[PDB]
């Protein structure tokens, strides 16, 4: 009996744990810190807390690894410090962003076998794991995390690459936007600790309005929509229509000076790229996943917008599980735990024999 590990490499947060558990044992910032002017490096929470003397780097951008040296450090730390395991003793399932470059898939594979000596490994597409976690084989996943939002149509277990689309706007962008609009109210949140306060405000007080214009009129007319927030000292601030204007940017990217379509349109557009014969199944299975889909009211709003774009005879169904922030990781935990998983992973033998390119024939 062997124990597999599951690692979901997010652009903002890494989720790591043991297959079979219903939640990741470790969730920490995907950051590597190094001495600013001169322990050689730090990772995660400790790097973040020691930023005063460290230069921080985020090796994953838009779900794609951009620095392999730093990524090795995150993984090294994940194994030895966060999970407290010897990697050479465990099969490892890693997640990847949709449309992850072929070169990157091979790299990840080579690092696991050559650097960490994993006895076996597998790479799964994040969106697909989320669909599985929701108990479905067909549907369209709208995965929105840190730097990017993806719309991924999946049919009978497999994503349809040609129809995968993306909005280059996600959580960090919403946090930065909240920072900006809060200044118009006369608040300055510029430092790292201050940006963290803004993120908390976004995560705790923001919500998606079903009807934005009407929500704006309401805010302007009364103080019904106002909420109070207490800063780390004791200063209490008041936030109004910023609560819903912040996440509104997901639906109206022009709010950030972006020309691309909002998430509801991107979802509709991905659906229209699929064979008419399966579109009914996509509209009826819109699965939301990722931290940025956690805003109250987002499912109701997605339902409304998609219903407006689709024929009136199309049944629209938005699935927004409460645990959707870890949906990708949970899907991985289940997959890695199946009695049939032992045959799907790339083993050391296979790697030794075929090399990194084996990933394209074992994981697709």
């Amino acid at each position: 009996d062997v124990q597999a590990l599951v690692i979901d490499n997010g652009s903002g947060m890494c989720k790591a744990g043991f297959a079979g558990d219903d939640a990741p044992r470790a969730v920490f910032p995907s950051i590597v810190g190094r001495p600013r002017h001169t322990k050689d490096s730090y990772v995660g929470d400790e790097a973040q807390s020691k930023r005063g003397i460290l230069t921080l780097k985020y090796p994953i951008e838009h779900g794609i690894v951009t620095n392999w040296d730093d990524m090795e450090k995150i993984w090294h730390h994940t194994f030895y410090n966060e999970l407290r395991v010897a990697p050479e003793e465990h099969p490892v399932l890693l997640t990847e962003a949709p449309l992850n470059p072929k070169a990157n898939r091979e790299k990840m594979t080579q690092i696991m076998f050559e650097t960490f000596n994993t006895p076996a490994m597998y790479v799964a597409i994040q969106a697909v794991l989320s669909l599985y976690a929701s108990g479905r084989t067909t549907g369209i996943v709208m995965d929105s995390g840190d730097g990017v939002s993806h719309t991924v149509p999946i049919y009978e277990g497999y994503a349809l690459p040609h129809a995968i689309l993306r909005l280059d706007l996600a959580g960090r962008d919403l946090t930065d936007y909240m920072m900006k609009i809060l200044t118009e109210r006369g608040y300055s949140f510029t430092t790292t600790a201050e940006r963290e306060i803004v993120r908390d405000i976004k995560e705790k007080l923001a919500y998606v309005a079903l009807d934005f214009e009407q929500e704006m009129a309401t805010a302007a007319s009364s103080s019904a929509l106002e909420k109070s927030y207490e800063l780390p000292d004791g200063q209490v601030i008041t936030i109004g229509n910023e609560r819903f204007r912040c996440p509104e940017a997901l639906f109206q990217p022009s709010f950030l000076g972006m020309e691309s379509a909002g998430i509801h349109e991107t979802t509709y557009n991905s659906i229209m790229k699929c064979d008419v014969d399966i579109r009914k199944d996509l509209y009826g299975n819109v699965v939301l996943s990722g931290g940025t889909t956690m805003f109250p009211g987002i499912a109701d709003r997605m339902n409304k917008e998609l219903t407006a774009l689709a024929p009136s005879t199309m049944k629209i169904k938005i699935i927004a599980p409460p645990e959707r922030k870890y949906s990708v990781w949970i899907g991985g935990s289940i997959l890695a735990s199946l009695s049939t998983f032992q045959q799907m992973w790339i083993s050391k033998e296979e790697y030794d024999e075929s090399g990194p390119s084996i990933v394209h024939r074992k994981c697709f």
């Binding site: 079979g20 558990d21 219903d22 669909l131 599985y132 976690a133 929701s134 108990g135 479905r136 084989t137 067909t138 009978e156 277990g157 497999y158 645990e323 949970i330 899907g331 935990s333 289940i334 997959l335 735990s337 199946l338 009695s339 049939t340 998983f341 045959q343 799907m344």
Partner: protein, 123 residues
């Protein structure tokens, strides 16, 4: 993948039912076909013989109202795996308790029955 039960799957016309039991696919005794635990997830393979001799397949993953996430997720994945094993010849159907398709319901001569309970989650 080639699980022992996969080797048994879709060999001749008829119905086969397995229950997801702690991350594994377990056959359901034939005498109990139609009796579904509402706290469980199942995989049903309906094999129909075609004129040329080959078999037609319809894979249904049935989800009880109280089945745990590991069970419904496993049922969905085993369904993709079984289809893959069957050369992609199976049409997959998601069947939720209380909202099953006429086709699925029609597989049970006397009508299927629901019973509270089931095997514990594998998490």
């Amino acid at each position: 993948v080639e699980h022992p039960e996969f080797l048994k799957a879709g060999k001749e016309p008829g119905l086969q039912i397995w229950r997801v039991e702690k991350f594994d696919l377990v056959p359901v005794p034939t005498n109990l076909y139609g009796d579904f635990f509402t706290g469980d997830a199942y995989v049903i393979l309906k094999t129909v013989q075609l004129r040329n001799g080959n078999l037609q397949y319809d894979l249904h993953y049935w989800l009880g109202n109280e089945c745990s996430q590991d069970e419904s997720g496993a049922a969905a994945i085993f369904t993709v795996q079984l289809d893959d094993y069957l050369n992609g010849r199976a049409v997959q159907h998601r069947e939720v308790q209380g909202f099953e398709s006429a086709t699925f319901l029609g597989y049970f001569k006397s009508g299927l029955k629901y019973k509270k309970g089931g095997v514990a989650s594998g998490f």
